[PDB]
Design a protein around this ligand. Sequence first.
Ligand code: DOO
Length: 190
Amino acid sequence: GLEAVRKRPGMYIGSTSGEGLHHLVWEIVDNSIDEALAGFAKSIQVIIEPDDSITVIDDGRGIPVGIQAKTGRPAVETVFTVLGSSVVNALSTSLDVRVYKDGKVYYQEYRRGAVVDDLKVIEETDRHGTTVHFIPDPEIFTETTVYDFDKLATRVRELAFLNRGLHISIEDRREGQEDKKEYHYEGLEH
Ligand SMILES: CNc1cc(F)cc2c1[nH]c1nc(Oc3cnc(C)nc3)nc(N3C[C@H]4CCN[C@H]4C3)c12
């Protein structure tokens, strides 16, 4: 399964250069955009964390957490472990997901694609949505693991335009260069 992704990442993300590094972000963001298209997510945050890891937050319904009859596993686990989202998981040292749903925070983490523990309720919550955080694997991204804020921001702006009505932001939390841009193109209320 995902072991094939780790050994032939070029076949799944096109390049293991800086281009592939950035592609990981778009694979995750595309899931959030699908939840905006479904009509439930209204706001997406993309964050470059101080260690060049990435957090993507949406306020949609939250990935389904119920057990699937076919797999016997929670749907959210299958999202990350069965062969875009699972490709990002495979090519990350660690990926953690938090699903905010029905007053509960469901949490699972993976390491180089492998499950750490069964999905668990860790907290109560009043919000809804999905947060994915991932650390790209330098064993895969041997040229660079350093994100380009302008490159991400340029595409985030384009995505806001193409998904008119969506609020989407990009934030850099790295030392000496903290920045944030927020985008929102108005609908019929304009
Ligand atoms: C950082 N965010 C993020 C990241 C991410 F990797 C996945 C999701 C994600 N946010 C999500 N929200 C939903 O919402 C749904 C809730 N309920 C249903 C029935 N479908 C979708 N579903 C999600 N799923 C379920 C599948 C439907 C199409 N895309 C797949 C991933 C995500």
